[PDB]
Amino acid sequence: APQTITELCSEYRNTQIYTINDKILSYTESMAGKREMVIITFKSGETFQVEVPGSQHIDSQKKAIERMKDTLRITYLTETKIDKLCVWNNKTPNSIAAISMKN
Amino acid sequence: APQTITELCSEYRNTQIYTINDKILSYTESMAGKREMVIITFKSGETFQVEVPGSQHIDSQKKAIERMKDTLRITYLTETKIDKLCVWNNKTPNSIAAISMKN
Amino acid sequence: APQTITELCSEYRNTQIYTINDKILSYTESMAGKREMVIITFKSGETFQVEVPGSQHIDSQKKAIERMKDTLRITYLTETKIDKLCVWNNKTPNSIAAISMKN
Amino acid sequence: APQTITELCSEYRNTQIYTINDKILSYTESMAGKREMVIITFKSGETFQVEVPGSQHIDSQKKAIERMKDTLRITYLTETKIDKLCVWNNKTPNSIAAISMKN
Amino acid sequence: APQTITELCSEYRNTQIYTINDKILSYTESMAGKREMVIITFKSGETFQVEVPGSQHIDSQKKAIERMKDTLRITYLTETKIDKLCVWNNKTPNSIAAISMKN
Ligand SMILES: Nc1ccc(O[C@H]2O[C@H](CO)[C@H](O)[C@H](O)[C@H]2O)cc1
Ligand SMILES: Nc1ccc(O[C@H]2O[C@H](CO)[C@H](O)[C@H](O)[C@H]2O)cc1
Ligand SMILES: Nc1ccc(O[C@H]2O[C@H](CO)[C@H](O)[C@H](O)[C@H]2O)cc1
Ligand SMILES: Nc1ccc(O[C@H]2O[C@H](CO)[C@H](O)[C@H](O)[C@H]2O)cc1
Ligand SMILES: Nc1ccc(O[C@H]2O[C@H](CO)[C@H](O)[C@H](O)[C@H]2O)cc1
């Protein structure tokens, strides 16, 4: 299995690593129909989303998707610094695939 | 996908943005039958609810409804400031569709 | 939909409001068969429970019962002050229907 | 229903109350097959477990088992003082049936 | 049932104990398809993973795998020191079977 987020990210096309090194500036969560998602922004001006579960997600990703949103909420509330985000760049906002945090 | 809560809110009928910019004043949670819900209030005098799951909700919203309630509880307990709320105004109290929080 | 704990409590047959205005003194949790419940007490001596799921409960209450127990634990662990509790008074300990907290 | 952990514990066979009055010394969690459990210890030299789910458990206990493990973890991480433990003494280490915390 | 992580670790093949006595240096979480996992690192330079659920896991481990990931996130966020890890050494990075922490 991959040993670092970069290793993991390099396994998928249409992805790139954003080296955030910062806490989340804003957290947005929606339970509106067809828009059950989370959006986060940073002081850098970058915006990212955890996508609404859909056709392109495999079954195994369902729990992971819910975990990622849990992670973003607690990271926001605790002001925990995010190191890097591996994101798909074929979506707007860019779509979160993986996250890493360094202490 | 929407980039902000304002963009997200604009996609729906009967919704509107309430700029809160304040922490929750009161949190109420009910496990009484047909009233399995959460009610939040602000010192401005505005009251909002996360609705009891009903037939208007689609399947993808079920986990989202539970998430929103989780978020309100931790937001209240931590005295975290809420920036905006996108709410359905055809319900009383106004029904929460989405929330945004900024540091 | 109800806008306060008193309003939802008043919808009921055999309930009453308890003004607590205090943090929880003790928290008890059981995973023993047929006694899967939570019991909390206050310095006043008053004792309450979140009942074991049973035939008197409608299906939509199942998830809410688990949420209420989650709330009581984090409320206890954070020493958060409870405002009021709506309880069904035909059970001992008095059975929690709803909880409210303000700060 | 029972008013206290001691009253609840007495409703069962092969159980007894351990007065701990102390925070958890160590926490051990396993996801190894057939050993999916939690083990805790105290400065007193006592060791306890939340058993691996099995035939001895009834359906209503499944979520309760998961809840107890959640409680032990958060109790350990917050250095929360445990009052009493109701344990089954026909298992080694003794098996947790209920827990109480007082502040 | 085993009384310590050492006793537990010894019941499986291809495992070994890693004495850590340190907080997690980095935490990585992925929701990418086929890579739904968590990777943790320590200042020692060691790297461990919670494997993607697969054919090597039995039913009972599914909830345990998700719990382990929950434990790693909260342990990382709280800078809690990890005492030891029981890992399967037939995977790269070494795969977490159990974890222990002492206060
Ligand atoms: N095998 C494979 C092929 C495509 C792929 O990406 C697609 O799915 C992702 C969600 O899983 C993102 O939505 C991304 O934007 C989509 O383009 C991921 C894996
Ligand atoms: N397609 C579609 C489906 C539902 C809908 O709104 C209804 O459901 C909302 C929750 O989903 C709110 O309860 C709102 O008050 C209702 O009016 C609008 C459009
Ligand atoms: N119409 C109606 C519905 C429920 C009701 O309360 C019953 O259910 C409660 C939990 O839902 C408590 O268990 C209470 O002790 C029971 O008496 C009373 C009237
Ligand atoms: N009806 C009933 C049946 C068994 C019982 O105890 C058994 O199950 C417990 C788990 O629930 C503990 O594992 C205990 O060690 C076992 O002896 C209690 C009540
Ligand atoms: N009975 C039995 C047989 C094999 C076994 O190990 C395999 O599964 C583990 C997770 O369950 C790890 O993935 C390990 O690396 C695999 O080798 C565990 C138990």
Side-chain angles (χ1 to χ4, degrees):
Chain A
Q3 306 206 246
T4 61
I5 186 168
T6 298
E7 195 172 315
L8 193 147
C9 210
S10 299
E11 299 193 331
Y12 300 81
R13 76 152 172 164
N14 289 149
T15 63
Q16 85 191 259
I17 286 288
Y18 274 87
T19 307
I20 311 302
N21 179 36
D22 195 16
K23 59 180 178 170
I24 296 164
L25 168 58
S26 83
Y27 166 93
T28 296
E29 173 194 326
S30 166
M31 50 164 268
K34 300 318 219 202
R35 293 296 186 199
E36 305 84 351
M37 65 188 297
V38 164
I39 304 173
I40 64 174
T41 68
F42 292 98
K43 212 156 279 76
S44 61
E46 294 292 343
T47 297
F48 301 103
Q49 69 168 308
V50 167
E51 284 175 272
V52 177
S55 209
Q56 21 51 56
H57 293 119
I58 57 186
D59 261 66
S60 56
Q61 287 177 287
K62 285 288 286 157
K63 280 182 177 53
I65 287 162
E66 298 308 300
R67 177 183 295 286
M68 184 57 73
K69 285 173 289 188
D70 294 346
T71 294
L72 294 180
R73 184 183 49 212
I74 189 59
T75 294
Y76 171 77
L77 300 174
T78 56
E79 295 174 304
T80 296
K81 269 208 304 183
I82 290 177
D83 194 42
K84 299 171 187 312
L85 283 177
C86 167
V87 310
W88 282 289
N89 54 33
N90 66 332
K91 297 283 165 64
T92 306
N94 282 178
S95 176
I96 298 170
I99 183 168
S100 64
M101 291 160 245
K102 188 259 305 191
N103 198 154
Chain B
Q3 302 287 308
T4 66
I5 192 173
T6 296
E7 304 197 338
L8 189 152
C9 212
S10 78
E11 305 176 353
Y12 299 86
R13 181 184 131 230
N14 313 127
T15 58
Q16 80 190 248
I17 288 287
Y18 271 86
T19 292
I20 309 297
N21 184 203
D22 191 21
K23 67 184 168 67
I24 297 167
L25 170 66
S26 301
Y27 165 92
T28 298
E29 175 189 330
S30 167
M31 56 163 265
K34 294 79 86 164
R35 299 301 192 198
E36 299 90 356
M37 66 191 299
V38 166
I39 297 160
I40 60 171
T41 70
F42 294 94
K43 46 110 170 296
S44 69
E46 296 297 339
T47 290
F48 302 99
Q49 66 168 311
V50 169
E51 293 178 81
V52 172
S55 66
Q56 71 275 28
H57 302 116
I58 60 170
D59 301 336
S60 54
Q61 285 179 292
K62 306 225 302 68
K63 280 182 282 182
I65 292 175
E66 298 310 301
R67 179 182 292 288
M68 188 57 70
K69 286 177 294 192
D70 291 351
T71 295
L72 294 184
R73 181 183 54 214
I74 192 59
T75 294
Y76 171 76
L77 294 173
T78 55
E79 294 183 64
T80 294
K81 261 197 180 187
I82 290 168
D83 193 28
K84 296 181 172 58
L85 280 179
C86 168
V87 310
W88 279 289
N89 56 30
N90 56 354
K91 248 46 171 281
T92 305
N94 283 349
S95 171
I96 298 168
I99 8 98
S100 58
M101 298 165 224
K102 78 189 182 187
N103 201 151
Chain C
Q3 316 226 16
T4 61
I5 187 171
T6 295
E7 215 182 337
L8 63 79
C9 211
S10 286
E11 295 190 315
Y12 282 91
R13 304 187 49 82
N14 312 150
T15 49
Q16 69 182 82
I17 292 288
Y18 275 80
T19 294
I20 303 299
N21 184 216
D22 197 14
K23 62 179 187 64
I24 294 169
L25 173 62
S26 72
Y27 166 90
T28 293
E29 183 190 318
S30 163
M31 55 163 268
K34 302 195 76 174
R35 292 296 198 207
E36 304 86 358
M37 65 188 297
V38 166
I39 302 166
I40 58 169
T41 72
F42 296 90
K43 194 185 180 192
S44 67
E46 218 44 80
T47 300
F48 304 98
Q49 63 167 311
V50 172
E51 291 177 83
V52 174
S55 50
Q56 72 274 38
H57 296 120
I58 59 169
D59 298 346
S60 59
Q61 285 181 288
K62 278 28 177 295
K63 240 99 293 190
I65 287 169
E66 299 307 301
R67 174 179 296 293
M68 186 58 77
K69 283 178 294 195
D70 289 351
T71 297
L72 294 187
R73 182 179 58 208
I74 192 165
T75 290
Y76 170 78
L77 295 176
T78 58
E79 188 172 40
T80 298
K81 192 156 70 161
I82 287 86
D83 185 41
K84 289 168 187 179
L85 280 175
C86 170
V87 312
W88 286 288
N89 52 19
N90 63 329
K91 296 286 170 59
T92 297
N94 283 148
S95 177
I96 299 175
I99 184 175
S100 61
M101 309 177 261
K102 78 174 319 169
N103 65 19
Chain D
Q3 318 299 308
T4 68
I5 189 175
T6 297
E7 188 200 328
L8 185 152
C9 206
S10 313
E11 303 187 328
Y12 303 76
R13 171 196 204 310
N14 313 120
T15 52
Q16 69 192 72
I17 289 277
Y18 271 83
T19 294
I20 279 82
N21 186 20
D22 197 9
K23 62 173 199 60
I24 293 165
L25 175 56
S26 78
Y27 168 87
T28 295
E29 171 194 328
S30 172
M31 52 161 269
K34 307 294 175 184
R35 246 39 152 150
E36 303 88 353
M37 65 192 294
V38 166
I39 302 164
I40 61 178
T41 69
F42 297 97
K43 297 185 301 188
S44 66
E46 309 174 303
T47 298
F48 301 102
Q49 71 171 310
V50 165
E51 288 176 83
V52 172
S55 57
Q56 72 279 33
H57 297 119
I58 60 176
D59 261 311
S60 57
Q61 283 176 296
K62 286 182 192 310
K63 288 183 184 281
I65 293 168
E66 300 307 301
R67 178 182 295 285
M68 182 64 66
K69 291 179 279 183
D70 292 346
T71 294
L72 301 182
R73 182 180 55 213
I74 190 56
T75 295
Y76 168 83
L77 300 173
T78 58
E79 291 178 75
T80 291
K81 191 171 298 172
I82 291 174
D83 183 353
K84 305 182 188 314
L85 285 175
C86 168
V87 309
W88 282 284
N89 55 37
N90 61 343
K91 254 48 175 282
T92 305
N94 282 175
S95 174
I96 299 170
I99 187 169
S100 56
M101 288 146 248
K102 165 228 70 68
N103 78 129
Chain E
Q3 306 217 94
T4 63
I5 185 175
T6 295
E7 177 181 7
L8 187 152
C9 211
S10 107
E11 302 180 328
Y12 295 85
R13 287 179 198 137
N14 307 310
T15 57
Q16 84 194 241
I17 286 292
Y18 265 88
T19 59
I20 311 303
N21 186 218
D22 198 9
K23 51 177 169 291
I24 296 173
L25 173 56
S26 73
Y27 166 86
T28 299
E29 173 190 324
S30 172
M31 51 167 263
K34 306 309 231 194
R35 292 297 190 203
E36 304 86 356
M37 65 188 296
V38 157
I39 303 168
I40 60 172
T41 69
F42 296 97
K43 103 213 170 322
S44 66
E46 301 269 27
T47 298
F48 305 96
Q49 71 172 309
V50 172
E51 292 175 84
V52 171
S55 76
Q56 73 281 28
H57 300 117
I58 57 178
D59 293 325
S60 51
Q61 288 175 289
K62 283 175 46 169
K63 50 196 167 44
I65 290 171
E66 300 308 298
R67 174 183 298 288
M68 185 56 71
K69 283 178 291 187
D70 292 353
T71 296
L72 296 183
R73 178 181 52 220
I74 192 62
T75 292
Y76 168 78
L77 293 172
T78 56
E79 297 183 291
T80 292
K81 289 183 184 174
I82 285 177
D83 195 40
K84 300 174 186 179
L85 288 171
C86 172
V87 307
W88 282 284
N89 57 35
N90 60 341
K91 295 290 175 38
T92 302
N94 277 179
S95 178
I96 299 168
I99 186 173
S100 65
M101 44 201 93
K102 52 127 83 165
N103 176 210

